[PDB]
Amino acid sequence: NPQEIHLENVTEEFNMWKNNMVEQMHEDIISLWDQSLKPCVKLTPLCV
Amino acid sequence: NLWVTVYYGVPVWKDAETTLFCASDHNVWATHACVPTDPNPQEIHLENVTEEFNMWKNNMVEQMHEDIISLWDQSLKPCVKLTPLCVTLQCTNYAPKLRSMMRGEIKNCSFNMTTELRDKKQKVYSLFYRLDVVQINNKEYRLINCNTSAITQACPKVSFEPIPIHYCAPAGFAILKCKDKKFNGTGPCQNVSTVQCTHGIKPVVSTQLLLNGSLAEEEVIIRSENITNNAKNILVQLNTSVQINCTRPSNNTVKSIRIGPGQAFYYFGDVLGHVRMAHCNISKATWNETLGKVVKQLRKHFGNNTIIRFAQSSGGDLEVTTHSFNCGGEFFYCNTSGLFNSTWISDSLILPCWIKQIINMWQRIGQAMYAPPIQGVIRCVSNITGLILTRDSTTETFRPGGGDMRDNWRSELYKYKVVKIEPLGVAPTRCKRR
Amino acid sequence: IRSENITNNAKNILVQLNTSVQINCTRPSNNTVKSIRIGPGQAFYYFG
Amino acid sequence: DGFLGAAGSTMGAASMTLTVQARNLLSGIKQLQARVLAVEHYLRDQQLLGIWGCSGKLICCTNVPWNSSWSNRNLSEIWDNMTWLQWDKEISNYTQIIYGLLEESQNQQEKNEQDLLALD
Amino acid sequence: DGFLGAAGSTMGAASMTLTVQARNLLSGIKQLQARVLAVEHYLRDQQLLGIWGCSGKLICCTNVPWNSSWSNRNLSEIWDNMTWLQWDKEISNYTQIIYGLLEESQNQQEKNEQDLLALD
Amino acid sequence: DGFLGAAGSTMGAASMTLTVQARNLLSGIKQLQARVLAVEHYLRDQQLLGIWGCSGKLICCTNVPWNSSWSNRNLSEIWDNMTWLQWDKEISNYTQIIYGLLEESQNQQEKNEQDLLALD
Amino acid sequence: EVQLVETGGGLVQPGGSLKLSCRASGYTFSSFAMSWVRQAPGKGLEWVSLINDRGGLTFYVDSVKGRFTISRDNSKNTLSLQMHSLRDGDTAVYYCATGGMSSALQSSKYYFDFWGQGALVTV
Ligand SMILES: *[C@@H]1O[C@H](CO)[C@@H](O[C@@H]2O[C@H](CO)[C@@H](O[C@@H]3O[C@H](CO)[C@@H](O)[C@H](O[C@H]4O[C@H](CO)[C@@H](O)[C@H](O)[C@@H]4O)[C@@H]3O)[C@H](O)[C@H]2NC(C)=O)[C@H](O)[C@H]1NC(C)=O
Ligand SMILES: *[C@@H]1O[C@H](CO)[C@@H](O[C@@H]2O[C@H](CO)[C@@H](O)[C@H](O)[C@H]2NC(C)=O)[C@H](O)[C@H]1NC(C)=O
Ligand SMILES: *[C@@H]1O[C@H](CO)[C@@H](O)[C@H](O)[C@H]1NC(C)=O
Ligand SMILES: *[C@@H]1O[C@H](CO)[C@@H](O)[C@H](O)[C@H]1NC(C)=O
Ligand SMILES: *[C@@H]1O[C@H](CO)[C@@H](O)[C@H](O)[C@H]1NC(C)=O
Ligand SMILES: *[C@@H]1O[C@H](CO)[C@@H](O)[C@H](O)[C@H]1NC(C)=O
Ligand SMILES: *[C@@H]1O[C@H](CO)[C@@H](O)[C@H](O)[C@H]1NC(C)=O
Ligand SMILES: *[C@@H]1O[C@H](CO)[C@@H](O)[C@H](O)[C@H]1NC(C)=O
Ligand SMILES: *[C@@H]1O[C@H](CO)[C@@H](O)[C@H](O)[C@H]1NC(C)=O
Ligand SMILES: *[C@@H]1O[C@H](CO)[C@@H](O)[C@H](O)[C@H]1NC(C)=O
Ligand SMILES: *[C@@H]1O[C@H](CO)[C@@H](O)[C@H](O)[C@H]1NC(C)=O
Ligand SMILES: *[C@@H]1O[C@H](CO)[C@@H](O)[C@H](O)[C@H]1NC(C)=O
Ligand SMILES: *[C@@H]1O[C@H](CO)[C@@H](O)[C@H](O)[C@H]1NC(C)=O
Ligand SMILES: *[C@@H]1O[C@H](CO)[C@@H](O)[C@H](O)[C@H]1NC(C)=O
Ligand SMILES: *[C@@H]1O[C@H](CO)[C@@H](O)[C@H](O)[C@H]1NC(C)=O
Ligand SMILES: *[C@@H]1O[C@H](CO)[C@@H](O)[C@H](O)[C@H]1NC(C)=O
Ligand SMILES: *[C@@H]1O[C@H](CO)[C@@H](O)[C@H](O)[C@H]1NC(C)=O
Ligand SMILES: *[C@@H]1O[C@H](CO)[C@@H](O)[C@H](O)[C@H]1NC(C)=O
Ligand SMILES: *[C@@H]1O[C@H](CO)[C@@H](O)[C@H](O)[C@H]1NC(C)=O
Ligand SMILES: *[C@@H]1O[C@H](CO)[C@@H](O)[C@H](O)[C@H]1NC(C)=O
Ligand SMILES: *[C@@H]1O[C@H](CO)[C@@H](O)[C@H](O)[C@H]1NC(C)=O
Ligand SMILES: *[C@@H]1O[C@H](CO)[C@@H](O)[C@H](O)[C@H]1NC(C)=O
Ligand SMILES: *[C@@H]1O[C@H](CO)[C@@H](O)[C@H](O)[C@H]1NC(C)=O
Ligand SMILES: *[C@@H]1O[C@H](CO)[C@@H](O)[C@H](O)[C@H]1NC(C)=O
Ligand SMILES: *[C@@H]1O[C@H](CO)[C@@H](O)[C@H](O)[C@H]1NC(C)=O
Ligand SMILES: *[C@@H]1O[C@H](CO)[C@@H](O)[C@H](O)[C@H]1NC(C)=O
Ligand SMILES: *[C@@H]1O[C@H](CO)[C@@H](O)[C@H](O)[C@H]1NC(C)=O
Ligand SMILES: *[C@@H]1O[C@H](CO)[C@@H](O)[C@H](O)[C@H]1NC(C)=O
Ligand SMILES: *[C@@H]1O[C@H](CO)[C@@H](O)[C@H](O)[C@H]1NC(C)=O
């Protein structure tokens, strides 16, 4: 049951192009990807 | 009629050991987890404060040592591991008709290596220095490390140039700077000031001679843990520097082959001209005056009528018996015997130097590194700012000693002490709680 | 005698003794150990 | 002056710079451990001041008399001729004794306050 | 006695050892997380005492009357025949109700104090 | 309302929700660093309130007069027509000046209190 | 050793205002609390007012709490007393004096250590 509180008479300025939440999402997604691949078979015998 | 009164914020402290922060204004010493420095750092002079210092029990040195080793290893981790190199080599002399001191120093070796595909082999010819290659019994040779450890190739894009590093106290702690002129490393300092961060200390790595360090304010300062114990090192801080001009005059090229998917091995190719020995020049008059000043300061501890003799280092391996340093990215091992060849009784000097590509840093066994060759001709000029001496009747004998890197860092950290702030205290006053 | 459920035969029973019993264990043969190197800095120890 | 500038000054003069040192107490694993320890130390000192009833003061007077054995100097020598470093050294052996008495005094005061509040 | 020695004692007697338990609240990733949580918990309790106006006291009286429904025992049974563990169990369901009232009382007191200070 | 619900309300009305925002300030390496910084920030604000003598209050009156240059609006405009965001923007340049004066005032008060306590 | 010299006015009518001052030298002015004591022409001594060494704390006898203000300036080495109303019972020689209070970290005084010469206030 997450909450949301409406802010009356508040006009916050947004800028989606300077939003640092995107850089964190990018790093977190890459980190999870690499962690998933780390404990897996490394196919060095294939380069033949 | 006095009552206990509690005070918080009392300007007192106790000796303490804590973790210091990195600050700095690709490079092997560049640290990402290191805060930008303050363009206007503060220093607060402490009047009428006589703090006792002891540079030989300073825990800032152990942290500096661990941090430097950690950064070194982190830099080498994401690099090519040269396991395909420990193969039998067939070698001949690079310049069979050469009469300079480089005769027999460079060998032209052939080996099969590996290729990107597991099914193929290639034939690689490369030059190696004699000091990196051990004879098995063209002749058969192996790399010197094959009998001890694996080789990690240093990444060719990462510079070895020292970067000044500032150590900063955490909140609740302060760094006290001696500032007492002619301070010899122990005892009270009467000019103590409080700082947040140390000056920028360059992690310069060298043996025997300390390069690119600080100078003494008025006179050569001789510091030792126990000046009468011949098992301890003597650190001599000069008040004036001596220039040393080091060069690798040959114009060398670098070749590169691939040894696996995404892996590449860089190696020393043809010499584009004559083969010449690396060397360093020190002016004779400057050294003679510097050494005489050192002798006077030694006489103050050993006697006005004692004979002070300097001699070359005797036993040990090349790393300890020579002056080791990184110049241009190459590792030089200079003889130095011409600098410690005199008896003191009450135009230029040329030092031969050898180059090695396979090194074992920090006196560790089991973690060997291969330094890629540097393209072109190398020249550098360094400032000799201090010496490390050891001591061996009526005559004392001194030798270059060296080899323990924490002594080099002591020569910079000797003036700093870390203390913990103890803000609580009590005192009697005529003040009763109602 | 301790158990999570003494009537459930899928559970283990832990018996804590009030007195100990000595057990004398031996490997009577006098064995030697040999060692060879298998790589730079690597060594394999084996039963000789 | 700045941080610790009063360290060599007399106890009286240095008592006027308590906010300077107080501000500078708060101002990867090894650094997180150092910061957590700094916080725990700070909080222990604040808790100790709270126990004594000095939670909001830099200078706090109490009801524990000076025992003389701790120090038999008069106020003129202590406040005009000594520094806080010298005082800290001089009575180090008695610090825990003083702290114990301070705690006992506040416990009695809290009970007495409660009993006074109970009067209708 | 030492830490928690009063746990089995009556509520009255155990109220005399509050500093013993208070001192023992402050006294690689998993351990740093445990220490950070211990600090955050401690600070939340101190903030809550501050909100109620009890920031510097171990025993703090307020202006919220006892509602009887929470517990209809007399003072003799609560302070002489019960332990704090039994009391904690007995009124657990009403803890947040009491906390809410305590906060409301302090907010009114702060406004009233400000209004009294405004009188010339 | 809930957390920050009063952000768009007038300064007077929003002063009645201080406990709501106060509770929500406390409520692997990157997360530990974020939590340690949150704690250090909170403690610096509490230390600053302590230095000013406001360690236990959400609304705290002091002895520093308003200098007019900081803001020449009357109380009716500030408390009835402005929000706290607008006020924060309007006097940002003078925040450190005000803070400095607040510290000086408390230091004088502490000395004066001690001197009054010294009278037999 | 210590010179305390009062300066002041002459004849003032009831309902007026009169200011006295005291200059001091020969000791550190800022290190001592100071006070004013008055003597009616035919009577003995009575204490009138007290100021701390820092000047932040002032104390008065009830009879002058709404009439007299005591202040000091430690850079000018000057103690001042501003009196209003000045009823007939206030005619007296007013002396400035050093002592009478001590700031917790100093030993106790509770005596008047040094006296001036005295200004004569006639209503
Ligand atoms: C003691 O201090 C002196 C002075 O700081 C120091 O000598 C300096 O060394 C640096 C590094 O070798 C020299 O800078 C180089 O100059 C050459 C000129 O040919 C450049 O080619 C170098 O650039 C190459 O390397 C860079 C690495 O980051 C690459 O990014 C670049 O693209 C090139 O590949 C570099 O600029 C500097 O000139 C000298 N200074 C003097 C006066 O000779 C000395 O080495 C120090 N001693 C010790 C022991 O550290
Ligand atoms: C190392 O020696 C080999 C020969 O043993 C050199 O390779 C020869 O180079 C000459 C040119 O100078 C060619 O004509 C030969 O055909 C080469 N031989 C082979 C087998 O390739 C090699 O160049 C030497 N290394 C260096 C760096 O000069
Ligand atoms: C390389 O391998 C071949 C076998 O394919 C061998 O004949 C040759 O001698 C090897 N080269 C060296 C330098 O050992
Ligand atoms: C092999 O390594 C040992 C040290 O472990 C060394 O003593 C020996 O000399 C090395 N072999 C050669 C040929 O140098
Ligand atoms: C200590 O500092 C003073 C002033 O800074 C200076 O005159 C004095 O020579 C210094 N002492 C030493 C030993 O440097
Ligand atoms: C060497 O010393 C001289 C004179 O102090 C100085 O100008 C020069 O910059 C120094 N060089 C280095 C690398 O420290
Ligand atoms: C270095 O010390 C010598 C005396 O040992 C002195 O003559 C010389 O001037 C000093 N140099 C400096 C730069 O202080
Ligand atoms: C350093 O100075 C201290 C001064 O007390 C002296 O005792 C010590 O022997 C000195 N050491 C050296 C190596 O000069
Ligand atoms: C220095 O070493 C000598 C020889 O071991 C010893 O007798 C002397 O006590 C030592 N001095 C100190 C200060 O440790
Ligand atoms: C080193 O080179 C510089 C010029 O860069 C020269 O002035 C200096 O004398 C040289 N030093 C020696 C010892 O040759
Ligand atoms: C310089 O070298 C000569 C070599 O004979 C030596 O006698 C002299 O003492 C040295 N020092 C000075 C300052 O001349
Ligand atoms: C050595 O000579 C100096 C004068 O430069 C003198 O002060 C010192 O005492 C002498 N030492 C001895 C052991 O003769
Ligand atoms: C340095 O040169 C001298 C010249 O006599 C030689 O005896 C010595 O062994 C050399 N040292 C090294 C480490 O090569
Ligand atoms: C030491 O000096 C003498 C005299 O110049 C020289 O003959 C000898 O070779 C020198 N020693 C070394 C190791 O160079
Ligand atoms: C080395 O030789 C190459 C090829 O002749 C030339 O381009 C380069 O400039 C030379 N480098 C130096 C330092 O002489
Ligand atoms: C352990 O003791 C409890 C006592 O209530 C009993 O209910 C339980 O069955 C016992 N379990 C065993 C395994 O003896
Ligand atoms: C023990 O196991 C039996 C068989 O599954 C079950 O009927 C009984 O309820 C269990 N007892 C407990 C206490 O879980
Ligand atoms: C240091 O001592 C002198 C002499 O007592 C004193 O005048 C000075 O104020 C002292 N320093 C400080 C910072 O108090
Ligand atoms: C001072 O402390 C001692 C214990 O060190 C104690 O015996 C003595 O009674 C104390 N003085 C007073 C007045 O209580
Ligand atoms: C403080 O004690 C010393 C030493 O007995 C004495 O000389 C001094 O006069 C005393 N001061 C006071 C104010 O009692
Ligand atoms: C504190 O105890 C030490 C012994 O551990 C003693 O040397 C020192 O003088 C004592 N100090 C006081 C003030 O009693
Ligand atoms: C435990 O209960 C007994 C009996 O009521 C009581 O005398 C004793 O004090 C209690 N223990 C504690 C620690 O209060
Ligand atoms: C006690 O609490 C109940 C709610 O549980 C409430 O209805 C009742 O009015 C409260 N008693 C008083 C006296 O307010
Ligand atoms: C408390 O309540 C119990 C139960 O009704 C009763 O027996 C006891 O006497 C009461 N005590 C007081 C002091 O009212
Ligand atoms: C608290 O609520 C539980 C139900 O969740 C109930 O069993 C218990 O008796 C209640 N306690 C009180 C004191 O109301
Ligand atoms: C928003 O503005 C309107 C108009 O002034 C006002 O009635 C309303 O209460 C404001 N919102 C809040 C949350 O105060
Ligand atoms: C208001 O602040 C200014 C500095 O910005 C200052 O000059 C002025 O005196 C202040 N007003 C008062 C009444 O102090
Ligand atoms: C506040 O200032 C405004 C602007 O001058 C004015 O219109 C308003 O009446 C003032 N209010 C009060 C209460 O002074
Ligand atoms: C604060 O300073 C900025 C300039 O950095 C200025 O534009 C702004 O108007 C100033 N605000 C006030 C209230 O003085």
CB contacts of C41 in chain B (<8 Å) are: 148-150, 366
Which phi and psi (to 5°) does residue E19 adopt? -75, -20
CA-B365 nearest atom, ligand 4: 5
Nearest to D53 among E39, E42, E56 (CB): E56
Buried b (16+ CB within 10 A) or exposed e, G97-118: bbbbbbbbbbeeeeebebebeb
Alpha-carbon span B32 to D28, nearest angstrom = 11
Say whether residue G107 is in contact with chain D using an 8 A CB cutoff: yes
Helix (H, G, I), strand (E, B) or coil at B45: strand
Alpha-carbon span B280 to B278, nearest angstrom = 7
Q: At a CB cut-off of 8 Å and minimum separation 6, what does A48 contact?
A: B117, B118, B119
Q: Which residues pair with B175 in a beta bridge?
A: B195, B418
3-state SS, chain E, equals: CCCCHHHHCCHHHHHHHHHHHHHCCCCCHHHHHHHHHHHHHHHHHHHHHHHCCCCCCCCCCCCCCCCCCCCCCCHHHHHHHCCHHHHHHHCHHHHHHHHHHHHHHHHHHHHHHHHHHCCC
Residue of D nearest to G104 (CA): D75
Q: Is the dihedral of CA B13, B14, B17, B18 positive or negative?
A: negative
DSSP H or E stretch at residue B74: helix B60-76
C-beta of F69 in contact with ligand 27 (< 6 A): yes
CA of B284 to the centre of ligand 14 (A): 14
**Ligand showing the shortest atom-to-Cα distance for residue D71:** 21
**Resolution at which this structure was determined, Å:** 3.2
Ligand 3, residues B92, B108, B112, B139: which to mutate, most atoms within 8 A of Cβ? B112
CA of A10 to the centre of ligand 26 (A): 10
The HSE-up count of residue G41 (CA atoms within 13 Å, CB side) is 7
Which phi and psi (to 5°) does residue F94 adopt? -105, 5
Whose tokens are 């290190």? That residue is G31
Q: Which residues pair with B245 in a beta bridge?
A: B281, B381
Residues of the domain holding G85: 3-123
The HSE-up count of residue B198 (CA atoms within 13 Å, CB side) is 23
Q: In chain F, what's the furthest Cα-to-Cα distance?
A: 59
Alpha-carbon span G115 to G117, nearest angstrom = 7
CB contacts of D2 in chain B (<8 Å) are: 42, 44, 194
Q: Which residues pair with B254 in a beta bridge?
A: B268
Query: Inter-chain contact D40–E26, Cβ cutoff 8 Å?
Result: yes
Q: For residue B178, how many other CB atoms are within 10 A of its CB?
A: 21
Helix (H, G, I), strand (E, B) or coil at A34: helix
Q: Which residues pair with B234 in a beta bridge?
A: B224, B389
**Ligand showing the shortest atom-to-Cα distance for residue E77:** 24
Alpha-carbon span D106 to G56, nearest angstrom = 30
Query: Inter-chain contact A45–B118, Cβ cutoff 8 Å?
Result: yes
Alpha-carbon span B58 to B17, nearest angstrom = 9
DSSP H or E stretch at residue B192: none
Which phi and psi (to 5°) does residue F87 adopt? -65, -45
Q: Which two tokens stand for residue D117?
A: 């509040």
Contact between residue B313 and residue B339 where contact means Cβ atoms under 8 Å apart: no
Q: Is the dihedral of CA G64, G66, G67, G68 positive or negative?
A: positive
Q: Which two tokens stand for residue G84?
A: 């209003």
List strand residue ranges (DSSP E) for chain G, in order.
3-7, 16-25, 34-39, 45-51, 58-60, 68-73, 78-85, 92-99, 112-115, 119-121
Torsion of CA C7, C13, C19, C22, to 10 degrees: 140
Contact between residue B283 and residue B254 where contact means Cβ atoms under 8 Å apart: no
Q: Is the dihedral of CA E110, E111, E112, E117 positive or negative?
A: positive
Q: At a CB cut-off of 8 Å and minimum separation 6, what does F106 contact?
A: F51, F52, F53
Which phi and psi (to 5°) does residue D9 adopt? -85, 175
Q: Minimal Cα–Cα distance from B68 to chain D, Å?
A: 15
Q: What is the DSSP string of chain F?
A: --TTGGGGS-HHHHGGGHHHHHHTTT--HHHHHHHHHHHHHHHHHHHHHHHTT-TT-SS---SPPP-STT----HHIIIII--HHHHHHHTGGGHHHHHHHHHHHHHHHHHHHHHHHT--
Which phi and psi (to 5°) does residue E97 adopt? -65, -45
Enter the DSSP assignment of D81. Answer: I
Q: Which residues pair with B244 in a beta bridge?
A: B282, B382
Helix (H, G, I), strand (E, B) or coil at B221: strand
Q: Which two tokens stand for residue G5?
A: 């010299």
Helix (H, G, I), strand (E, B) or coil at B419: strand
Distances in Å between the Cα of B142 and the Cα atoms of B90, B109, B139 are 9, 10, 10
Q: Which two tokens stand for residue F89?
A: 């923007």
Alpha-carbon span E99 to E85, nearest angstrom = 19
Say which amino acid occupies B365. Answer: I
For residue G44, give the CATH number of its domain.
2.60.40.10
CB contacts of G108 in chain F (<8 Å) are: 120
Say whether residue F30 is in contact with chain E using an 8 A CB cutoff: no
Contact between residue B377 and residue B355 where contact means Cβ atoms under 8 Å apart: no
Contact between residue F55 and residue D55 where contact means Cβ atoms under 8 Å apart: yes
Q: Determine which of D47, D52, D106 to mutate to test the interface with E (most E C-beta atoms within 10 Å).
A: D47
Whose tokens are 């007191």? That residue is E109
DSSP H or E stretch at residue D111: helix D95-117
Alpha-carbon span B191 to B169, nearest angstrom = 20
CA of B207 to the centre of ligand 8 (A): 25
| Domain count along chain G | 1
Q: Which two tokens stand for residue E110?
A: 């702060």
Contact between residue B139 and residue B91 where contact means Cβ atoms under 8 Å apart: yes
If you take atom 14 of ligand 3, which residue's CA is the nearest one?
Answer: B111
Q: Which residues pair with D40 in a beta bridge?
A: none
Enter the DSSP assignment of B37. Answer: P
Alpha-carbon span B328 to B355, nearest angstrom = 12
The HSE-up count of residue B397 (CA atoms within 13 Å, CB side) is 7
Q: Minimal Cα–Cα distance from G108 to chain B, Å?
A: 8
CA of F93 to the centre of ligand 29 (A): 6
Among F68, F62, F73, residue whose Cα is nearest residue F101: F62
Among G30, G38, G43, G41, residue whose Cα is nearest residue G67: G38
If you take atom 6 of ligand 4, which residue's CA is the nearest one?
Answer: B147
List strand residue ranges (DSSP E) for B206-320, in order.
209-211, 221-224, 234-260, 263-271, 278-283, 307-310
